[PDB]
Write a protein that binds this ligand. Structure first.
Ligand SMILES: NC(=O)C1=CN([C@@H]2O[C@H](COP(=O)(O)OP(=O)(O)OC[C@H]3O[C@@H](n4cnc5c(N)ncnc54)[C@H](OP(=O)(O)O)[C@@H]3O)[C@@H](O)[C@H]2O)C=CC1
Ligand SMILES: NC(=O)C1=CN([C@@H]2O[C@H](COP(=O)(O)OP(=O)(O)OC[C@H]3O[C@@H](n4cnc5c(N)ncnc54)[C@H](OP(=O)(O)O)[C@@H]3O)[C@@H](O)[C@H]2O)C=CC1
Lengths: 192, 192
């Protein structure tokens, strides 16, 4: 049985693993936006592309002129949708199982959020990598939030930086990136 | 209809998962036949129907006067078949997926046999659910059988009864149904 190559990509504030407040991210991290773009857009060969899968709320939080996310197939989930290919760049899917059946033309698949989607996928056997941007701040409790990852990190193994570099290819991975009061690092995890 | 979830519905004798002999089921479970009927017929949406898919041999095994099965779109597969709508109830097709392009009326899709169809379709990623009637008998080696399921069950998760109830909605699910020397239970399985 052929299966797609799927990873979760997310940015979280430690230690609680907070992901959002209201319907947005509690930070604006310049370099992290760029990493996100590169990682999700990069392919091993030209004239190929990846897909991104998101929840309706995340699609909606993207300003209209900036959607779909360029250079990648965008897949949007809503329990109100009918499976439908809108154009070459946008597909509507009515369940996770269908979403994973609509990625036949891409190289890699990235689950890009939000909370409910992440929580639904982390226990799917198809997900073989977690790409976590671990964020730190002097006083995390000062950062307001209502959305958290509920991942069983004990059943995942954080890999050495070398393994991440293997996955991201040519992208530069700086350590301990500072922006304002935040410090962060990109990480890669595999299943135990 | 684009990439629908499909469910396999079958009754098998444990542990070998035997399904027939000659071209017949080695038992007559009256309650099972009624459950089969309710599950495959019932819908939630307004003016929808479910679709049942079968191999050419299974079709031919239903007495001509009792086909098509009432209240469901019957889809019959054969490698010699052109993709054609016979009438509003019957479709001919050479592939599951090609058959699905000709439907629109549909809520749920069920694979109802036969053995070759079962063993082949099991490894098609459109299949998301298995409804297996697990039958037991004191002497499973007194019930001669020639046909078996070749299901990779290590890749599947047997769900709790609460999840089956939720799938079937209204249908009454009795436990440990005894008929003659047979004892059976209804089960649901999903992909890991
Ligand atoms: N820190 C990070 O890296 C990221 C953070 N986030 C954050 O996450 C938050 C949003 O998450 P959340 O509110 O949970 O929204 P999501 O983006 O997860 O969207 C949830 C919606 O997706 C649909 N959906 C979910 N499950 C299914 C299913 N099985 N089948 C079909 N449709 C499904 C439903 O749509 P409908 O209601 O239409 O049925 C549901 O309301 C924001 O705060 C956002 O900033 C987002 C991405 C990255
Ligand atoms: N226990 C249970 O719940 C059930 C048990 N059964 C049992 O199953 C047995 C019958 O199974 P079987 O004889 O194999 O018959 P099937 O109903 O599976 O028919 C096989 C035929 O289907 C067509 N076909 C097969 N594979 C495909 C494919 N991949 N794509 C398109 N068409 C295909 C072919 O038609 P062509 O040759 O024209 O190409 C082939 O000969 C019996 O003993 C019956 O009692 C059946 C249903 C339920």
């Amino acid at each position: 049985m052929l299966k797609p190559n799927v990873a979760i990509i997310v940015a979280a504030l430690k230690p609680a693993l907070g992901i959002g407040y209201k319907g947005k991210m509690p930070w604006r991290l310049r370099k992290e936006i760029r990493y996100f773009k590169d990682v999700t857009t990069r392919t091993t060969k030209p004239n190929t592309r990846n897909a991104v899968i998101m929840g309706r709320k995340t699609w909606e939080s993207i300003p209209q002129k900036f959607r779909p996310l360029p250079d990648r197939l965008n897949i949007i989930l809503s329990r109100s949708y009918e499976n439908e290919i809108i154009d070459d760049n946008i597909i509507h899917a009515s369940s996770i199982e269908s979403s994973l059946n609509l990625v036949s033309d891409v190289e890699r698949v990235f689950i890009i959020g939000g909370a409910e989607i992440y929580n639904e996928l982390i226990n799917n056997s198809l997900v073989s990598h977690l790409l976590i941007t671990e964020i730190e701040h002097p006083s995390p409790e000062s950062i307001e939030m209502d959305t958290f990852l509920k991942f069983p990190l004990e059943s995942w193994t954080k890999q050495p930086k070398s393994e991440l570099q293997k996955f991201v290819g040519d992208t530069v991975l700086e350590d301990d990136i500072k922006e304002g009061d935040f410090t962060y690092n990109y990480t890669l995890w595999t299943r135990k």
